[PDB]
Amino acid sequence: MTTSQKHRDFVAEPMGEKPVGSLAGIGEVLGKKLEERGFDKAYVVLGQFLVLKKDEDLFREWLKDTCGANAKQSRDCFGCLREWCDAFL
Amino acid sequence: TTSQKHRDFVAEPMGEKPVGSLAGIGEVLGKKLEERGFDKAYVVLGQFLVLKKDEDLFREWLKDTCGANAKQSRDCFGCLREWCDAFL
Numbered sequence: 001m002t003t004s005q006k007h008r009d010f011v012a013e014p015m016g017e018k019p020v021g022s023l024a025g026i027g028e029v030l031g032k033k034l035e036e037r038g039f040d041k042a043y044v045v046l047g048q049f050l051v052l053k054k055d056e057d058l059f060r061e062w063l064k065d066t067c068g069a070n071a072k073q074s075r076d077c078f079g080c081l082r083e084w085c086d087a088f089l
Numbered sequence: 090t091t092s093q094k095h096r097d098f099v100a101e102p103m104g105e106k107p108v109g110s111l112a113g114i115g116e117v118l119g120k121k122l123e124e125r126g127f128d129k130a131y132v133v134l135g136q137f138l139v140l141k142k143d144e145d146l147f148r149e150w151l152k153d154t155c156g157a158n159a160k161q162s163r164d165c166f167g168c169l170r171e172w173c174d175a176f177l
Contacts, residue, residue, distance in 0.1 A: 014177055043177060047138025050131050088176055089102055089131060 004076060010042070011083045018042040025069065025076030033067035049081045056082075095164065098130075099171045106130045113157065113164030121155035137169045144170075 001008070007024035015022070021031040022042050039045050052058045059081075060074035069077065095112035103110070109119040111130050127133050140146045147169075148162035157165065 016177060041141075043138050044141060047135050047140075050135025051139055052135075053126075053129075053132060085131075089104065089134075 003079070007076065007080050007083070010080050011087060014088060015042045015046065015084065020045055023077050024080035025073040025078075027073075030067045030069050030073060037066055039066070045077075046081055046084070049078075049085075054082065054085065091167065092164065095168050095171075098168050099175060102176060103130050103134065103172065108133055111165050112168040113161040115161070118155045118157050118161060125154055127154070133165070134169055134172070137166075137173075142170065142173065 004024045006022065010018070010022050010024060018041065019031070020026055020034045020039055020042050021028065023045060026034065034040075034045065039048070048062060049059050052062065056078055060069075060071075060078050063069040063074040063077060092112055094110075098106075098110055098112060106129065107119065108114055108122045108127055108130050109116065111133060114122065114133075122128070122133065127136070136150060137147050140150060144166055148157075148166050151157045151162045151165055
């Protein structure tokens with residue numbers, strides 16, 4: 001496994017009411033930005049991911065544009081949501 | 090308080106189901122949603138979640154997007170709401 005502990009913990013179970021900070025790649029700095037933009041729960045971000053038809057380029061771009069995530073951070077968050085969906089959607 | 094289409098949807102993961110699998114989304118609404126880029130039910134789940142599961146906003150969004158009436162929006166909303174209670 002080369003994933004973050006955060007990734008493993010998030011992909012292992014339904015997300016429910018988890019804050020955006022539970023997402024892999026989303027540390028406190030990106031988290032605060034997301035929240036201020038209205039993305040206050042991981043499921044709201046899951047929502048954007050689905051509205052964008054799980055497209056990697058658009059989602060990672062959306063993340064960069066919304067909270068200034070870098071390549072590694074957006075890749076980690078994308079991977080997190082992709083795997084979660086493969087497991088529970 | 091529900092149709093069997095509703096119960097069938099709410100009982101399992103939605104995977105790649107078309108939008109037409111959603112309670113209240115018939116062929117007419119389904120075509121209209123597809124033309125707007127909402128082809129799979131999970132994309133509509135996406136909008137539901139982006140709107141924070143808000144009934145009024147989601148139902149109004151559905152109406153504005155495909156012209157669903159009061160009953161059709163009610164059924165679709167209830168469908169996505171219960172599915173989330175079960176799997177989200």
